[PDB]
Amino acid sequence: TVPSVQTFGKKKSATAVAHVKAGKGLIKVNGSPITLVQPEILRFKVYEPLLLVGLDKFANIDIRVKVTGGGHVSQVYAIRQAIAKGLVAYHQKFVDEQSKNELKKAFTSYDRTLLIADSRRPEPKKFGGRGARSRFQKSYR
Template identity: 75%
Template sequence: MPVDQPHSSAPDILHGWGARQRGGRIRVKGGGQVSQIYAIRQAIAKGIVAFYQKYVDEQSKNEIKDILLTYDRTLLVADPRRCEPKKFGGPGARARFQKSYR
Protein backbone atom coordinates (compact mmCIF):
# COMPACT_ATOMS: atom_id res chain seq x y z
CA MET A 1 0.00 0.00 0.00
CA PRO A 2 2.01 3.03 -1.14
CA VAL A 3 -0.65 5.48 0.08
CA ASP A 4 0.13 4.91 3.76
CA GLN A 5 3.92 5.17 3.64
CA PRO A 6 4.31 8.94 4.12
CA HIS A 7 1.62 8.95 6.81
CA SER A 8 2.47 5.91 8.89
CA SER A 9 5.93 7.22 9.85
CA ALA A 10 4.75 10.68 10.90
CA PRO A 11 5.22 10.28 14.70
CA ASP A 12 8.87 9.36 14.03
CA ILE A 13 9.70 13.09 14.14
CA LEU A 14 9.65 12.77 17.93
CA HIS A 15 12.45 10.21 17.93
CA GLY A 16 14.99 12.86 18.91
CA TRP A 17 12.82 14.00 21.82
CA GLY A 18 13.30 10.77 23.70
CA ALA A 19 10.04 9.16 22.70
CA ARG A 20 10.86 5.61 23.68
CA GLN A 21 9.40 2.67 21.87
CA ARG A 22 6.61 1.20 23.92
CA GLY A 23 4.75 -1.98 23.25
CA GLY A 24 1.06 -1.78 22.67
CA ARG A 25 -1.78 -2.55 20.35
CA ILE A 26 -4.11 -0.21 18.57
CA ARG A 27 -7.37 -1.70 17.35
CA VAL A 28 -9.29 0.17 14.68
CA LYS A 29 -12.79 -0.54 13.42
CA GLY A 30 -14.73 0.89 10.52
CA GLY A 31 -13.80 3.16 7.68
CA GLY A 32 -11.36 2.42 4.90
CA GLN A 33 -7.66 1.68 4.99
CA VAL A 34 -6.50 5.28 4.76
CA SER A 35 -8.89 6.54 7.44
CA GLN A 36 -7.77 3.71 9.71
CA ILE A 37 -4.16 4.79 9.20
CA TYR A 38 -5.10 8.36 10.14
CA ALA A 39 -6.87 7.05 13.25
CA ILE A 40 -3.76 5.07 14.27
CA ARG A 41 -1.53 8.11 13.73
CA GLN A 42 -3.82 10.23 15.85
CA ALA A 43 -3.97 7.62 18.63
CA ILE A 44 -0.16 7.36 18.77
CA ALA A 45 0.32 11.14 18.82
CA LYS A 46 -2.35 11.70 21.48
CA GLY A 47 -0.88 8.87 23.54
CA ILE A 48 2.58 10.43 23.45
CA VAL A 49 1.19 13.80 24.56
CA ALA A 50 -0.84 12.16 27.35
CA PHE A 51 2.23 10.22 28.51
CA TYR A 52 4.30 13.39 28.74
CA GLN A 53 1.50 15.15 30.60
CA LYS A 54 1.19 12.38 33.18
CA TYR A 55 4.78 11.20 33.68
CA VAL A 56 7.02 14.06 32.48
CA ASP A 57 6.85 17.81 33.04
CA GLU A 58 4.36 20.20 31.47
CA GLN A 59 7.00 22.10 29.51
CA SER A 60 8.09 18.99 27.59
CA LYS A 61 4.47 18.16 26.86
CA ASN A 62 3.85 21.63 25.43
CA GLU A 63 7.01 21.41 23.29
CA ILE A 64 5.98 18.07 21.82
CA LYS A 65 2.43 19.29 21.30
CA ASP A 66 3.69 22.37 19.43
CA ILE A 67 5.97 20.21 17.27
CA LEU A 68 3.10 17.89 16.37
CA LEU A 69 0.73 20.77 15.63
CA THR A 70 3.23 22.50 13.34
CA TYR A 71 4.08 19.22 11.59
CA ASP A 72 0.49 18.12 10.97
CA ARG A 73 -2.54 19.47 12.82
CA THR A 74 -4.59 16.33 12.15
CA LEU A 75 -2.32 14.37 14.50
CA LEU A 76 -3.98 15.98 17.53
CA VAL A 77 -7.20 17.57 16.23
CA ALA A 78 -9.98 15.27 15.02
CA ASP A 79 -12.04 15.97 11.91
CA PRO A 80 -15.65 16.47 13.11
CA ARG A 81 -17.29 16.00 9.69
CA ARG A 82 -19.80 13.16 9.62
CA CYS A 83 -22.42 12.02 7.13
CA GLU A 84 -25.68 13.91 7.63
CA PRO A 85 -28.77 11.67 7.80
CA LYS A 86 -31.42 11.79 5.09
CA LYS A 87 -34.64 13.68 5.79
CA PHE A 88 -38.09 13.24 4.28
CA GLY A 89 -39.23 15.29 1.30
CA GLY A 90 -36.13 14.81 -0.81
CA PRO A 91 -33.58 12.34 -2.15
CA GLY A 92 -30.86 13.32 0.32
CA ALA A 93 -30.05 15.23 3.47
CA ARG A 94 -30.47 18.74 2.01
CA ALA A 95 -31.81 18.28 -1.55
CA ARG A 96 -35.59 18.50 -2.02
CA PHE A 97 -37.74 16.89 -4.67
CA GLN A 98 -38.34 19.13 -7.67
CA LYS A 99 -41.64 21.02 -7.60
CA SER A 100 -43.80 21.24 -10.72
CA TYR A 101 -46.51 23.88 -11.23
CA ARG A 102 -48.08 22.36 -14.36
Protein backbone atom coordinates in the same frame (compact mmCIF):
# COMPACT_ATOMS: atom_id res chain seq x y z
CA THR B 1 4.31 -2.48 37.45
CA VAL B 2 5.09 -1.23 33.92
CA PRO B 3 3.65 2.19 32.92
CA SER B 4 0.34 1.67 31.07
CA VAL B 5 -1.99 4.44 29.83
CA GLN B 6 -4.79 3.58 27.36
CA THR B 7 -4.75 6.36 24.73
CA PHE B 8 -7.35 6.51 21.94
CA GLY B 9 -7.97 8.62 18.79
CA LYS B 10 -11.08 8.99 16.62
CA LYS B 11 -11.94 10.08 13.04
CA LYS B 12 -15.62 9.36 12.18
CA SER B 13 -16.69 5.84 13.37
CA ALA B 14 -13.09 4.58 12.87
CA THR B 15 -11.80 4.14 16.45
CA ALA B 16 -8.38 2.91 17.62
CA VAL B 17 -6.90 2.14 21.08
CA ALA B 18 -3.12 2.40 21.67
CA HIS B 19 -2.00 0.46 24.78
CA VAL B 20 1.52 1.78 25.55
CA LYS B 21 4.17 0.00 27.68
CA ALA B 22 7.87 0.35 28.64
CA GLY B 23 10.46 -1.73 26.76
CA LYS B 24 12.30 -2.04 23.43
CA GLY B 25 10.23 -0.10 20.85
CA LEU B 26 7.19 -1.78 19.28
CA ILE B 27 4.76 0.33 17.18
CA LYS B 28 2.57 -2.49 15.84
CA VAL B 29 -0.76 -2.24 13.97
CA ASN B 30 -3.09 -5.29 14.24
CA GLY B 31 -0.13 -7.60 15.03
CA SER B 32 2.09 -6.52 12.12
CA PRO B 33 4.74 -3.74 12.47
CA ILE B 34 4.43 -0.04 11.48
CA THR B 35 5.55 -0.57 7.84
CA LEU B 36 2.41 -2.45 6.62
CA VAL B 37 -0.77 -0.36 7.33
CA GLN B 38 -2.22 -1.68 3.95
CA PRO B 39 -3.53 1.36 2.01
CA GLU B 40 0.13 1.33 0.80
CA ILE B 41 0.39 4.93 -0.52
CA LEU B 42 -0.77 6.22 2.92
CA ARG B 43 2.13 4.47 4.74
CA PHE B 44 3.87 7.88 4.61
CA LYS B 45 1.06 9.54 6.63
CA VAL B 46 1.49 7.10 9.57
CA TYR B 47 5.18 8.13 9.92
CA GLU B 48 4.24 11.83 10.52
CA PRO B 49 3.97 11.48 14.35
CA LEU B 50 7.32 9.60 14.34
CA LEU B 51 9.40 11.78 11.98
CA LEU B 52 8.50 15.21 13.45
CA VAL B 53 9.49 14.57 17.09
CA GLY B 54 11.95 11.76 16.15
CA LEU B 55 12.54 8.01 16.58
CA ASP B 56 14.58 8.65 19.79
CA LYS B 57 11.29 9.06 21.75
CA PHE B 58 10.02 5.56 20.80
CA ALA B 59 13.16 3.73 22.08
CA ASN B 60 11.49 3.31 25.52
CA ILE B 61 7.75 3.28 24.64
CA ASP B 62 6.05 0.12 23.26
CA ILE B 63 2.69 0.70 21.48
CA ARG B 64 0.21 -1.75 19.90
CA VAL B 65 -3.14 -0.93 18.24
CA LYS B 66 -6.45 -2.65 17.38
CA VAL B 67 -8.47 -0.68 14.79
CA THR B 68 -12.19 -1.16 14.00
CA GLY B 69 -14.94 0.90 12.33
CA GLY B 70 -15.09 3.20 9.29
CA GLY B 71 -13.25 2.13 6.11
CA HIS B 72 -9.65 1.86 4.85
CA VAL B 73 -8.41 5.47 4.68
CA SER B 74 -10.47 6.66 7.70
CA GLN B 75 -8.72 4.06 9.92
CA VAL B 76 -5.29 5.62 9.10
CA TYR B 77 -6.40 8.81 10.89
CA ALA B 78 -7.54 6.70 13.89
CA ILE B 79 -4.04 5.14 14.12
CA ARG B 80 -2.31 8.52 13.63
CA GLN B 81 -4.40 10.25 16.33
CA ALA B 82 -3.79 7.28 18.70
CA ILE B 83 0.02 7.27 18.28
CA ALA B 84 0.14 11.10 18.65
CA LYS B 85 -1.69 10.90 22.01
CA GLY B 86 0.33 7.79 23.02
CA LEU B 87 3.49 9.89 23.40
CA VAL B 88 1.74 12.74 25.25
CA ALA B 89 0.17 10.39 27.84
CA TYR B 90 3.63 8.90 28.57
CA HIS B 91 5.43 12.28 28.61
CA GLN B 92 2.74 13.92 30.81
CA LYS B 93 2.72 11.32 33.61
CA PHE B 94 6.29 10.02 34.06
CA VAL B 95 8.43 12.67 32.26
CA ASP B 96 9.09 16.45 32.66
CA GLU B 97 6.52 18.85 31.12
CA GLN B 98 8.95 20.79 28.86
CA SER B 99 9.38 17.71 26.64
CA LYS B 100 5.58 17.19 26.50
CA ASN B 101 5.00 20.92 25.75
CA GLU B 102 7.48 20.70 22.83
CA LEU B 103 5.31 17.86 21.42
CA LYS B 104 2.18 20.07 21.64
CA LYS B 105 3.65 23.11 19.85
CA ALA B 106 5.40 20.90 17.27
CA PHE B 107 2.03 19.39 16.23
CA THR B 108 0.41 22.88 15.95
CA SER B 109 2.69 23.89 13.03
CA TYR B 110 1.84 20.63 11.19
CA ASP B 111 -1.75 20.45 12.51
CA ARG B 112 -3.56 17.72 10.58
CA THR B 113 -5.93 17.11 13.53
CA LEU B 114 -3.39 14.91 15.44
CA LEU B 115 -4.42 15.70 19.06
CA ILE B 116 -7.72 17.47 18.32
CA ALA B 117 -10.79 15.34 17.49
CA ASP B 118 -12.42 16.28 14.17
CA SER B 119 -15.87 17.92 14.15
CA ARG B 120 -17.73 16.37 11.19
CA ARG B 121 -20.35 13.62 11.65
CA PRO B 122 -22.94 12.56 9.03
CA GLU B 123 -26.31 14.37 8.90
CA PRO B 124 -29.77 12.74 8.32
CA LYS B 125 -31.34 12.40 4.85
CA LYS B 126 -34.77 14.09 5.05
CA PHE B 127 -37.80 13.11 2.91
CA GLY B 128 -38.43 14.35 -0.64
CA GLY B 129 -35.05 14.33 -2.40
CA ARG B 130 -31.99 12.20 -3.20
CA GLY B 131 -30.00 13.42 -0.17
CA ALA B 132 -30.26 16.05 2.58
CA ARG B 133 -30.11 19.25 0.50
CA SER B 134 -30.54 17.76 -3.02
CA ARG B 135 -34.22 17.71 -4.08
CA PHE B 136 -36.02 15.70 -6.80
CA GLN B 137 -36.42 17.03 -10.35
CA LYS B 138 -39.58 19.12 -10.91
CA SER B 139 -41.87 19.50 -13.92
CA TYR B 140 -44.74 21.92 -14.69
CA ARG B 141 -45.38 21.29 -18.39
